[PDB]
Structure formats: C-alpha cells, structure tokens
Homo-oligomer: A and B are copies of this chain.
C-alpha cells in the first residue's frame, strides 16, 4: 500500500481545513449581504419619513398663508365699506339743501354714477386679488411637487450607487476567496505527491 500515513493525514487535514474555511466564508458573505439589505431598507424608511415631514411642513405653511389672506380680504372689504358708507352719507347730505327739481335730479344722477363707478372698481379689484391668492397657492404647491420629483431622482440615484458598490464588493470578495481556495488545494496536492 503506497500511501505514507503522515501524507494521508496531511491531505485529510487540508480537506477538512478547506471545508471549515469555505463554510466560514459562505456565512461571512451571507451576513454582509443581509446587513446591506437591512441598512438599505432602514434608509428607505427614513426617506419616506422625511418626505412626510416635508408635506406636513408645507401644509402647515399653507395653512398660515391662507388664514392671513383671509384676514387681508376682510380688511380690504372693510376699507371699501368705509368709503361706500361715506359716499352714501355725502350723497344724501348734499341733497338736503337742494330745492330746485332739476338740480335735485342732476345731483342724484351724479350720486348714482359715482356708486356704480366705485362698485365696478371694487368688484374688479376683488376678482384680481382672489385670483392672485389662488395663483400664489397653486405656485407654492407646484414648487413642492417639482422639488419632490428631483428629490426622488436623487434618492433613487443614491440607492442604486450603494447597491452597485455592494455588489462589486461582494464580487471582489468571492473572487479572492476562490483564488485562495484553489491555491491551498494546489499546495496540498503538491505536498501529497512529493511525500515518499
């Protein structure tokens, strides 16, 4: 029987050592991979929370703006009502001392036209103001939407880069592991063949 006992022992120790090494490498890689997925999932949840925070803040800001706009509308109406009340008062007072029919009608004609001129201006102003408010709110909302488009792009780019880094590192590690295993097997085969 032409196999030296110590040589057989050496070959068996190398096979056993290789088994343990390979098992450890497989577990190590599984752990590193699992960790990366865990981190990626937690990072994605953090980003969802940030997006929600951004929407809540914007809604809070929109709430304040709308309330202030309502007050400003109330104030604008109140100024117009003060002016209107003054005109009603002066319209009537002026007629109190007028005693010629034609003059009374002429002053009435002026009062009527004045009231219509101011009504037209007040109505038009309010349409212009309400529209501006509407446009401001739509513009704020759109800016928030646009920013979410680019943020989502950036978030997806970052995630794909981390994934790529992870897959490249795993591949380099697997490759080096294979090289080492083959070199250890190759050395053991030389040694076995050389043994007397």
Contacts and interface: CB of A to CB of B under 8 A. Distances in A.
A52 B51 CA distance: 8
B167 A127 contact: yes
A44 B84 contact: no
Interface of chain A, main secondary structure = helix
The winner among A120, A123, A160 for most chain B CB atoms within 10 A is: A123
Interface string A27-62: 001100110011011001100110110011011001
A66 B52 contact: no
A99 B3 contact: yes
18 contacts: A1-B99, A15-B91, A22-B84, A26-B81, A30-B73, A30-B77, A33-B73, A33-B126, A34-B74, A38-B70, A40-B134, A45-B59, A49-B59, A112-B185, A123-B174, A127-B170, A138-B156, A141-B156
